[PDB]
Design a protein around this ligand. Structure first.
Ligand code: Q2I
Length: 188
């Protein structure tokens, strides 16, 4: 077959019911996640190939980067709560991995301030139970799949993308294979 269980994707032995349609996990400490975001634009290219009926979710993980990694999961909850993901993703990746200027929770906050989020608004969100609930949702979704690595993408709590077998000589072809695989899996 063109798409084969075990090749372009794997099938979870323990399927997760009630899972998001398309669920991505990442860490701002994760080098391939940096590539997925600013080099490949995986999420946008996946979105462009799905109908308006399939929704996309993207969650941060705790298991990379120690204390700061956990701070970044809470900051990502702030980004989701305020709807400013598109404003802070590139600066957070650059701050962690390129300039290495993000070393503390205050340095994370600075990225939001520079992106135009008011300080009192960031602080209110950071300390809010709405954000605490989003942190809990991110942790529970990762735990449901016993997640041990990023980047990772899951379709309908049933299928996990397997990019390792794909040709990476051309980046545009790789991204297209990835998105077409997500589309195929979403249609199963
Ligand atoms: C710098 N910082 N971090 C959290 C709260 C404050 C002061 N507004």
């Amino acid at each position: 077959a063109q798409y084969e269980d075990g090749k372009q994707y794997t099938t979870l032995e323990k399927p997760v019911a009630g899972a998001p349609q398309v669920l991505e996990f990442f860490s701002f400490f994760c080098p391939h996640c940096y590539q997925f975001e600013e080099v490949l634009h995986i999420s946008d290219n996946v979105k462009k190939k799905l109908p308006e009926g399939v929704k996309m979710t993207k969650y941060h993980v705790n298991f990379m980067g120690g204390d700061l990694g956990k701070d970044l999961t809470q900051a990502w909850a702030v980004a989701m709560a305020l709807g400013v993901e598109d404003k802070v993703t590139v600066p957070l990746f650059e701050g962690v991995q390129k300039t290495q200027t993000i070393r503390s929770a205050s340095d994370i906050r600075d990225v939001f301030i520079n992106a135009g989020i008011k300080g009192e608004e960031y602080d209110a969100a950071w300390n809010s139970f709405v954000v605490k609930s989003l942190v809990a949702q991110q942790e529970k979704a990762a735990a449901d799949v016993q997640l041990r690595g990023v980047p990772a993408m899951f379709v309908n709590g049933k299928y996990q993308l397997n990019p390792q077998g794909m040709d990476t000589s051309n980046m545009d072809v790789f991204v297209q294979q990835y998105a077409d695989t997500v589309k195929y899996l979403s249609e199963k």
